[PDB]
């Protein structure tokens, strides 16, 4: 079956703003995760055709990935840091829902999420 369209990264009818927290999310949080040895499976949407996973989009109905997040941060899609944090959280949770505990992909997501939580605990106060 065909992949869905990816999550949107441009919509003029969506309100947005720059905040120092969103700027930290791009310059520190995304940047740090993206270069991790284990980032690559999370750097673009799941291509269920390529991966031969007929059920993926039956199971994962709110897909998200760091490719999408990167474009949203770079293209000023967000209103606040919470929208972006939620996208990370959805990406992580999706991986844990779809796969099994201790699978290599789950261990990889967990490595990224450990780093993510370290970086978010240092989120600047809004200014
Ligand atoms: C992310 C993610 N969540 O569920 C699936 C399925 C993936 C996923 C996305 C991908 O690009 C690739 C793979 C898979 O080839 C794999 C398996 C072990 C270690 C790394 C990679 C899984």
Curated annotation (Swiss-Prot):
State where the protein is found.
Answer: Nucleus; Chromosome
Give residue numbers for the site Acetylated histone binding: 99
The entry's stated outcome for residue 104 to G is: Found in a patient with a neurodevelopmental syndrome; uncertain significance
What does the entry's PTM section describe? Phosphorylation by CK2 disrupt the intramolecular binding between the bromo domain 2 and the NPS region and promotes binding between the NPS and the BID regions, leading to activate the protein and promote binding to acetylated histones. In absence of phosphorylation, BRD4 does not localize to p53/TP53 target gene promoters, phosphorylation promoting recruitment to p53/TP53 target promoters.
Glycyl lysine isopeptide (Lys-Gly) (interchain with G-Cter in SUMO2) cross-link position in this chain?
58
Out of the domains of life, which is the source?
Eukaryota
Q: In which tissues is it expressed?
A: Ubiquitously expressed.
Every copy of the Bromo domain together lies at 17-123
What assembly does the database describe for this protein?
Interacts with p53/TP53; the interaction is direct. Interacts (via CTD region) with CDK9 and CCNT1, acting as an associated component of P-TEFb complex. Interacts with RELA (when acetylated at 'Lys-310'). Interacts (via NET domain) with NSD3, CHD4, BICRA and ATAD5. The interaction with BICRA bridges BRD4 to the GBAF complex. Interacts (via NET domain) with JMJD6 (via JmjC and N-terminal domains); the interaction is stronger in presence of ssRNA and recruits JMJD6 on distal enhancers. Interacts with NSD3. Interacts with NIPBL.
> What disease association does UniProt give?
Cornelia de Lange syndrome 6: A form of Cornelia de Lange syndrome, a clinically heterogeneous developmental disorder associated with malformations affecting multiple systems. It is characterized by facial dysmorphisms, abnormal hands and feet, growth delay, cognitive retardation, hirsutism, gastroesophageal dysfunction and cardiac, ophthalmologic and genitourinary anomalies. CDLS6 inheritance is autosomal dominant. A chromosomal aberration involving BRD4 is found in a rare, aggressive, and lethal carcinoma arising in midline organs of young people. Translocation t(15;19)(q14;p13) with NUTM1 which produces a BRD4-NUTM1 fusion protein.
Role summary: Chromatin reader protein that recognizes and binds acetylated histones and plays a key role in transmission of epigenetic memory across cell divisions and transcription regulation. Remains associated with acetylated chromatin throughout the entire cell cycle and provides epigenetic memory for postmitotic G1 gene transcription by preserving acetylated chromatin status and maintaining high-order chromatin structure. During interphase, plays a key role in regulating the transcription of signal-inducible genes by associating with the P-TEFb complex and recruiting it to promoters.
Q: Any miscellaneous information on file?
A: JQ1, a thieno-triazolo-1,4-diazepine derivative, and I-BET, a benzodiazepine derivative, have been tested on tumors with success. Treatment with GSK1210151A (I-BET151, a I-BET derivative) has strong effets on mixed lineage leukemia and promotes myeloid differentiation and leukemia stem-cell depletion.
What's the family? Belongs to the BET family.
Q: What is known of its domains?
A: The NET domain mediates interaction with a number of chromatin proteins involved in transcription regulation (NSD3, JMJD6, CHD4, GLTSCR1 and ATAD5).
Protein name (record): Bromodomain-containing protein 4
Q: Can you name the source organism? A: Homo sapiens
Part of the intact protein present: 44 to 168 of 1362
